[PDB]
Design a protein around this ligand. Structure first.
Ligand code: A1AHN
Ligand code: A1AHN
Lengths: 812, 812
């Protein structure tokens, strides 16, 4: 027999269209899965869909009778947009939170999400079991790893009413969170129906006579989807290039289907050029599938009324890039990259998928005098933080021609308020005067113990980081929980007993370094790297230095503040407090440990690796950080170059080891502006150069030397001096004296000419651009918001200062 | 009374629809013009159009009764595409051939082209009268100018049967070429009609029922125009993106009108994106006027069915750049520059106006998988040489999807075979073993004497230069004729008496130099230049040298060979013969003077200024020329940088004055590749650098020195050497060692490392690109037609040679 609660839970899930969670432990989980599929199928006939099975690397009749799809863990990106009647996970040791989010959301309501666990003598051994991902966290310095993610995972089950844990013998355990489940009253489909189903069929039958909306509204499955289609069509039918409709919805709500049917409606309404801009064409799979579904519903014929152009040469073979329409009239659905805004001159409809994840300048450039459709995932898996969506909406409101804001709430595959969706959104967390504040260290042994106060505080800090993330990734939660040396610091205001403090700033610090010199030389003779550390293993490779990585240091993995309290001084105060704590200025575990009650580790430096940005760089420089490295190949999804800043926090020790690194980086950066850096704005490059020089000034031996006649004559021939003097007098065109620009720029920005001649910020920026970035006058004028004549007018005054110094130098 | 031949000629012109030429001499030409307008108007009533009057800076009733348009000589570009019933030219001293061509072609058949000459005691004083343009030819070295253009102008009249020369008293002179004119028999318009007029009305009434061709064929005025419209519409109605129709016709035949009505037909046929690519939007004035005429004939309404977008911010205010159509669907007529081929992704119809004048790579890029319309002016004023049109047609035939070739012959404003058009196409000339050949000097005193043999030979050489010219300019004829020091050299094969030799190569040499040092210093202290000379006044400004321009030199203004005999060795042989002639190797004027019968001038150098091109540079370098200067701003109409090459022809004299210039240019060019030169192909830049180094080797003191440890340690720190050695071993990514690339490239290409390490052509080109041009691996791989991996694979082998040399240098 079987426990009554298993068929009861399955029946409740089938009737209420909600998912059911089952966890099987033992060595013969196949029998349990077969018996759970038989029970699920015996009560309902309209849900017998395919079964998804995921592994890293009776029953015999069961496999040969039902459609079973096998998917690898690394191939879970291939099942995006599908829908399966029951999902199976085989290897616990491999399910990262990314895998769980990707593989659970693709189950229709009433199905079963079955997770198989290996036979265990006591569930109490789950908290210490070898993750296949733990191998990446461990390092030579820190080898042991205490698994805390599994601890919270097992405890989270008790908070889900649809989650049942069963054994090989099909017996419920007390850990199960749905042992108190009760049968629901039988339904009556003769007259009783959900109000949503009545509303949808009403909004469908009302517009059935009209075309093409009548035939393109029979594809929507939710009321919110129908309303989204209605407003999209009422903006398309308006045929006004002064309209802009944005669609923000959680993952799985059906943004792609609504936008695809809207694109089909735009095609049917007589639109010639339609452009879809997305970060990657592989995201445009379900969208184009629903565009094709709308075309089919519009009585179009394949290969006779439309041809599909698919890009096979690059990596994304399956990606659709172009669709041609030649039935009503020549129409094209072209996919362009977000950086290709130069092709939107004749754009009639530009649809920006995942507009939140697109960098803000790219979104600003993609908008024009046409009709713009926008999509954003503001919650759920792969979502965007609330801060970025708020910034985008604020920009749209400030610029607006006309902006329309619609939202989807009701999911498609499962009923609203699904229990399993609630649990997987809790386990993966997928949804005062600055001087008065104090910093506390958050203990990770209790923060992941699923205590109600601990869980509430964990959700608080997690949500803070969520907003500060162009794309949400729940793997960072596992990295934070199971890392061997990651420390979490939070900044709270003055708080009294009985009230949980409100986190205004959260700092995650990772301990790095203490790598043996033998390992350094072993790695430096090859290209392979342990990849455990970042700042040491990167400097030791870039500078070919075998002494830096043997130090002890801290990497600030993530520092985020409350978006409502940003730019008020909380982040800088938290950073200063952390630095002072690491400088030895402070002399059931409790969740919060004050900084004055734990002994800091002896650290020689603190470092950070982050995407370059003028505001971020200004903040880090104000925090006494100096650059050591700057990547040349910009990040494809972000558009920013990785920059590494290191601070010599330890006092009473010579900060000369960092002086050499800063000086080496400073001079390299000077002429690296012609290599993958030509695109940098002049002001940003000037600030980075100034910061690198300030860092290089730590070493007294790196102080610049004066310029003498003996070395000057080795650089400029007397005819070059004559040309410079002629230009300074205004008797020569600036194009003639232009190969001397690299030499003068290098002389000034390496310190030889810095003391002799005084240049302001604008003159320094123009000199840097024209000398090291090799920019034109037009580009420099546009970047600096100055007329072309004024750039040269202030450029001659730079020459009238260098020429005078050179003349006074040669004469005396 | 009036001479009978004046009303007779006017009546013949009115009846035959041919223009009439009248030249008036005296101080009261107003009376003659009034009496010629009265006579013209008294016989015909359907031609009383506006009168065009051109000046540099009875009759009273005449001005206030007829529409008179006044146009300045510098503003004659503003009357392109118009049509006037009678043209008047007031100032002889200002009518350049460009003005004559621009102002004569805008007269309808049967009108009068009246040229006013100041009262002259004897027409014999015309050959010596002060041109307002002569001031530009004269120079300090050569001041006197003998006017030969006026000489041929006066004699050319006798070859025109419709040209009458009259005085203030209206008396015909023997110089008149139409004194033997006789009255034509009166016509009969009741039944007799021209076959062309019957053919046109037949091809119109046949398609009257059909639309939109029926309403868009009533705008054509010639049979050839109607056929061009028919084939354009039959290619548009075909709606095939595998069609390409080119239209080659002389100036004034009506290419613009046919193409405009074709664009209107394409709009009416349901084309969404239509792009018109032209060298300048001001040429797209009559084309868009006829597009608008076709729209009006298609019953479109202004400001309700189409809106016109005109670019007012730039210089071309009147230029139309965009036309929007919203009749049933959004259609657009966008003007793009020829270098904007990246916007033709959705192009449904790309119409290339003046395709011959567009550089060949730009035309190759503008063509795609759509319908392409092409226009070319292969004859007449502002035309293109036959060689360029032949190259374009050959490229089209070799690439062809489908190519259609149509031609227009019959002009619009005047009858075919017009007499005045014949004369203005003669006055302005607007239409063997290599070792066995010999070079002859063509005397300019008899070449412009209008002798039949002299005129035939002048037309021969002129036609040779015409083909070698992206845009024909008849001002070069006046410059050749009236220049004070221009010498013409021609290359002919073995020829016997009684037969005029066939010119296989024509060389035009201009004598330059001998500028006083006082004038050099006077000009060098300002920006103003006499502009008489080019090579001296350019080197003396770029190099700030006060001794070069005082030499004596020759500038090869134009060297062209027969396009049928190109790349066979005639040009190089002619150049070598000219150089030997100037090196003193040869020890009713006759038209041809052998090189052994005239004393060459003592010349120190021979130079040439030309648009840079790999083939042209290779030819000049083979001719022992070395560069001295290279412009940064490429020519807008051509896309090529001006390069100046100077050869030290004189033997027995030290060529060290040029060694300094070549070395200064060579070292500057090295790092100037990052300034307006980044776009140069690697091979071309390498060849230019090699040629500049070969030129700099003339001075023994410019020989490169070895590389020593003392100077090497001043460039690379030991950590830089460690990084280079690590990269050479393949243990480091190539991105790390990239700021050392400028230093290594400069060391190798300035000669210090040239002897120590041996590099092939490909390695040298890659090193030059990556070091001095700062190109990426992808761009270099695409330019060199090699995979990206192979570029780096051969790039590491460059480093494995430099690193070994550096190690052997530091060790010992
Ligand atoms: C700025 C805050 C501190 C709070 O700012 P705060 O409260 O403190 O304001 P405050 O008064 O104190 O100072 C006033 C000053 O702040 C400035 N400011 C003001 N407002 C803002 C603002 N909104 N934003 C920014 N600055 C602002 C302003 O410039 C100035 O304002 P003023 O104009 O002077 O007044 C806080 O970070 C925040 O906002 N937002 C969170 C940003 C965040 O998340 N991390 C921050 C840096 S960490 C990134 C990592 O470390 C990630 S790991 C990683 C990832 C990938 N990769 C590579 O890429 C991968 C490729 O596959 C691969 O893995 C690897 O290769 C890698 O290596 N490592
Ligand atoms: C090449 C020929 C000698 C006959 O060639 P040739 O018969 O001799 O052939 P050959 O056997 O002897 O040698 C075999 C070698 O010839 C090569 N090759 C073979 N075939 C061709 C080919 N088709 N084309 C080219 N090379 C070819 C090949 O690379 C190789 O062939 P291989 O592959 O080695 O066998 C002849 O020129 C010709 O073709 N066509 C006429 C080109 C022409 O007209 N001038 C030539 C240079 S002058 C330009 C001025 O001087 C104009 S003034 C001015 C204008 C503006 N500006 C500035 O711009 C303005 C801005 O407003 C402003 O005014 C000012 O700032 C200024 O400063 N000055």
């Amino acid at each position: 027999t079987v426990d009554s609660r298993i068929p009861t839970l399955i029946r409740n899930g089938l009737q209420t269209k909600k998912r059911s969670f089952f966890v099987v432990v033992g060595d013969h989980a196949k029998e349990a899965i077969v018996h759970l599929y038989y029970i699920m199928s015996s009560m309902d006939v309209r849900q017998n869909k395919s079964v998804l099975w995921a592994y890293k690397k009776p029953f015999e009749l069961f496999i040969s009778l039902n459609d079973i799809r096998y998917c690898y863990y690394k191939e879970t990106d291939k099942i995006l947009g599908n829908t399966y009647g029951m999902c199976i996970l085989q290897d616990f040791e491999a399910i990262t939170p990314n895998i769980l989010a990707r593989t659970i959301e693709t189950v229709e309501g009433g199905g079963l999400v079955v997770l198989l666990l290996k036979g265990m003598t006591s569930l109490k051994q789950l908290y210490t079991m070898t993750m296949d991902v733990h191998a990446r966290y461990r390092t030579e310095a820190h080898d042991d790893v205490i698994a805390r993610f599994n601890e919270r995972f097992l405890l989270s089950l008790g908070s889900c009413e649809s989650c049942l844990v069963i054994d090989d013998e099909l017996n419920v355990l007390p850990i199960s969170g749905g042992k108190g489940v009760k049968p629901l009253p039988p339904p009556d489909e003769d007259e009783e129906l959900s109000p949503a189903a009545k509303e949808l069929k009403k909004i469908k039958d009302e517009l059935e006579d009209t075309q093409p909306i009548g035939s393109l509204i029979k594809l929507a499955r939710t009321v919110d989807q129908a309303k989204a289609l209605l407003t999209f069509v009422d903006a398309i039918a308006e045929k006004t290039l002064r309209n802009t409709v944005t669609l923000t919805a959680a993952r799985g709500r059906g943004k792609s289907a609504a936008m695809g049917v809207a694109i089909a409606a735009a095609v049917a309404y007589g639109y010639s050029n339609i452009f879809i801009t997305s970060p990657s064409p592989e995201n445009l799979k379900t969208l184009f599938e629903f565009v094709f579904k709308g075309f089919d519903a519009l009585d179009y014929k394949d290969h006779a009324d439309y041809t599909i152009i698919q890009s096979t040469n690059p990596e994304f073979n399956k990606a659709i890039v172009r669709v041609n329409i030649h039935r009503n009239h020549r129409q094209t659905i072209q996919y362009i990259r977000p950086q290709d805004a130069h092709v939107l001159g004749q754009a009639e409809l530009v649809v920006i998928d995942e507009a939140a994840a697109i960098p803000l300048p790219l979104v600003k450039k993609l908008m024009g005098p046409y009709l713009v459709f926008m999509a954003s995932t503001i919650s759920g898996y792969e979502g965007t933080g609330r801060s970025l969506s708020l910034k985008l909406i604020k920009q749209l409101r400030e610029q607006s021609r006309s902006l329309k804001e619609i939202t989807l709430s009701e999911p498609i595959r499962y009923a609203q308020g699904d229990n399993v969706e609630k649990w997987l959104n809790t386990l993966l967390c997928l949804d005062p005067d600055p001087s008065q504040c104090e910093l506390l260290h958050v203990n990770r042994d209790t923060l992941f113990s699923f205590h109600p106060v601990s869980e509430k505080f964990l959700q608080q800090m997690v949500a803070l980081y969520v907003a500060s993330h162009y794309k949400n990734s729940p793997n960072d939660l596992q990295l934070m929980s199971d890392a061997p040396a990651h420390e979490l610091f939070v900044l709270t205001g003055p708080i009294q007993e009985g009230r949980l403090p409100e986190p205004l700033c959260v700092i995650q610090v990772s301990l790095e370094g203490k790598i043996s010199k033998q390992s350094i030389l072993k790695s430096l003779s090859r290209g392979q790297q342990p990849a455990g550390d970042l700042i040491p293993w990167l400097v030791s490779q870039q500078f070919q230095d075998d002494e830096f990585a043997s130090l002890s240091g801290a990497r600030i993995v993530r520092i985020a503040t409350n978006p409502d309290y940003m730019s008020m001084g909380y982040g800088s105060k938290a950073l200063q407090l952390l630095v002072d704590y690491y400088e030895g200025k402070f002399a059931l575990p409790p969740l919060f440990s004050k900084l004055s009650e734990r002994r800091p580790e002896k650290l020689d430096y603190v470092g950070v690796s982050y995407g370059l940005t003028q505001q971020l760089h200004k903040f880090w420089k104000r925090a006494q950080f100096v650059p050591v490295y700057l990547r040349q190949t910009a990040n494809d999804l972000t558009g920013e170059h990785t920059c590494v800043m290191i601070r010599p926090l330890q006092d009473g020790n010579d900060p000369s080891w960092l002086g050499a690194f800063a000086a080496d980086f400073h001079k390299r950066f000077l002429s690296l502006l012609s290599y993958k850096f030509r695109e940098f704005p002049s002001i940003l490059a000037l600030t980075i150069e100034e910061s690198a020089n300030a860092g290089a000034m730590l070493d007294p031996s790196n102080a610049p030397t004066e310029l003498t006649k003996a070395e000057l004559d080795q650089l400029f021939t007397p005819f070059d001096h004559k040309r410079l003097e002629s230009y300074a007098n205004g008797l020569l065109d600036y194009h003639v004296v232009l190969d001397l620009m690299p030499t003068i720029a290098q002389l000034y920005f390496t310190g030889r000419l810095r003391e002799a001649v005084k240049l302001s910020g604008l003159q320094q920026a123009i000199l840097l651009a024209l000398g090291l970035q090799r920019k034109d006058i037009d580009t420099l004028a546009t970047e600096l918001n100055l007329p072309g004549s004024q750039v040269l007018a202030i450029f001659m005054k730079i020459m009238r200062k260098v020429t005078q110094h050179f003349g006074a130098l040669v004469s005396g």
